[PDB]
Design a binder for this molecule. Structure first.
Ligand SMILES: Cc1c(C)n(Cc2cccc(OC(C)(C)C(=O)O)c2)c2ccc(C(=O)N[C@@H](C)c3ccc(C(C)(C)C)cc3)cc12
Ligand SMILES: Cc1c(C)n(Cc2cccc(OC(C)(C)C(=O)O)c2)c2ccc(C(=O)N[C@@H](C)c3ccc(C(C)(C)C)cc3)cc12
Length: 278
């Protein structure tokens, strides 16, 4: 309706500053930095770009690990290698999202199982959201922004994998047009985590009490940060529901990979070895 300046908004603004500070510490590559890389507006070096098989073969030579596994199915060798690469990064994203989730005021004091339930269902939606920060119309920044894989190259992968990243790109172009910065995304991520309608929650009301404060802080943030924007808060609420129906089709997609590959779930001990050596 109208804005007041009455210590209540001062608390909502302080919560946004607190969420932004934790957001910066939890995630190294911010959207503000990712946008600087995508437009060259950075004194740092340009990332390596993978746009075909030659540039991918040239990019594989820059990695210390080898992983030959010589076989006849080289089209699946490349597709599996790329899929296992982003799979590994997803694990690193979870512990970063969990780190940020701990910093949301009140999250740690919740039931320990509900913290797992909120993260179990919310991690996929946050990765879906933060993936848009690394994308433009051409491709996506990968590996701490040191690599850039084009959208059409990912599109050309073998039958099941050529459609894995496409729904994410189609979401990113619609989501990036909202022009949210890191300050907006910090509260938007916190609202996604504290969703009281996750299946199997125990104490729903304490979760909604936290989210209502985050929803108020977000609305105050969007109206201040985006003066030339109309109904941006309602647009973000719809984008959350868009994630739910599109992330279930995402988990149904990779469950096919979990079965039609007959050996895709990376062994937990071997995956831990790659983590501890790097
Ligand atoms: C060496 C290697 C290993 C061991 N894995 C894990 C792994 C793969 C495949 C199956 C797998 O699981 C089973 C089947 C069990 C197994 O065989 O071990 C496990 C990789 C994943 C991706 C890439 C890569 O090259 N990724 C591309 C996208 C890129 C990204 C970034 C760059 C920079 C350096 C330019 C930033 C270059 C190239 C290389 C590797
Ligand atoms: C295809 C792809 C995407 C879309 N991404 C970004 C990404 C994915 C998942 C969540 C995620 O989340 C957010 C929050 C958006 C974020 O991180 O920004 C961001 C990648 C990152 C790295 C690699 C890779 O292939 N990297 C090579 C260099 C490697 C990896 C691992 C190995 C081991 C297994 C041998 C250790 C070797 C080589 C591939 C991808």
């Amino acid at each position: 309706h109208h804005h007041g300046s009455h210590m209540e908004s001062a608390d909502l603004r302080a919560l946004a500053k607190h969420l932004y500070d934790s957001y910066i510490k939890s995630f190294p590559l911010t959207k503000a930095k990712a946008r600087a890389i995508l437009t060259g507006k950075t004194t740092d070096k340009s990332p390596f770009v993978i746009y075909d098989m030659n540039s991918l073969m040239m990019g594989e030579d820059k990695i210390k690990f080898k992983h030959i596994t010589p076989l006849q199915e080289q089209s699946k060798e490349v597709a599996i290698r790329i899929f296992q690469g982003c799979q590994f990064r997803s694990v690193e994203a979870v512990q970063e999202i969990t780190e940020y989730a701990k910093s949301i005021p009140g999250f740690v004091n919740l039931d320990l199982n509900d913290q797992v339930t909120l993260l179990k269902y919310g991690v996929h939606e946050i990765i879906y959201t933060m993936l848009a920060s690394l994308m433009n119309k051409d491709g996506v920044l990968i590996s701490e922004g040191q690599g850039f894989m084009t959208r059409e190259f990912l599109k050309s992968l073998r039958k099941p994998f050529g459609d894995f990243m496409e729904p994410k790109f189609e979401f990113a172009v619609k989501f990036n047009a909202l022009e949210l910065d890191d300050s907006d995304l910090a509260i938007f991520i916190a609202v996604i985590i504290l969703s009281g309608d996750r299946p199997g929650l125990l104490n729903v009301k304490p979760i909604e009490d936290i989210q209502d404060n985050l929803l108020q802080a977000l609305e105050l943030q969007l109206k201040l940060n985006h003066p030339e924007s109309s109904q941006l808060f309602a647009k973000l609420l719809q984008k959350m529901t868009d994630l739910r129906q599109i992330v279930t089709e995402h988990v149904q997609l990779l469950q096919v990979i979990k079965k039609t590959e007959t050996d895709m779930s990376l062994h937990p001990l071997l995956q831990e070895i790659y983590k501890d050596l790097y």
